Design a protein around this ligand. Structure first.
Ligand SMILES: [Zn+2]
Ligand SMILES: [Zn+2]
Ligand SMILES: [Zn+2]
Length: 88
DNA sequence: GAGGTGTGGC
DNA sequence: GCCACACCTC
């Protein structure tokens, strides 16, 4: 009646709290990657949606994160964070 | 730079 | 489910 979301694969008894995390984990067993990049010529596929959204910034040149000292811009927040270490 | 992924807010 | 942070790995 009330229980955690479990992976019913024989060799996997792992569990998750969010249903979305289990659905993503199942794709590691089947190898499915339903999130396709429609950019003509790319062909990349991903198991989750967020790496595709992130990947897409490569094509669009979207770089919201900018260093306010040297003016260099990045497409990801983790890239800016690492860059800031250069200004310590 | 970039993908892969654990985790969480909405 | 979507999106994003943060960390890992190459
Ligand atoms: Zn599993
Ligand atoms: Zn692409
Ligand atoms: Zn800078």
């Amino acid at each position: 009646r009330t229980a955690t979301h479990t992976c019913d694969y024989a060799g996997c008894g792992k569990t998750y709290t969010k249903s979305s995390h289990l659905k993503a984990h199942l794709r590691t067993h089947t190898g499915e990657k339903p999130y396709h990049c429609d950019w003509d010529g790319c062909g990349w596929k991903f198991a989750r949606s967020d790496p595709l959204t992130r990947h897409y910034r490569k094509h669009t040149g979207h770089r919201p994160f900018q260093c306010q000292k040297c003016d260099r811009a990045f497409s990801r927040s983790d890239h800016l964070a690492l860059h800031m270490k250069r200004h310590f």
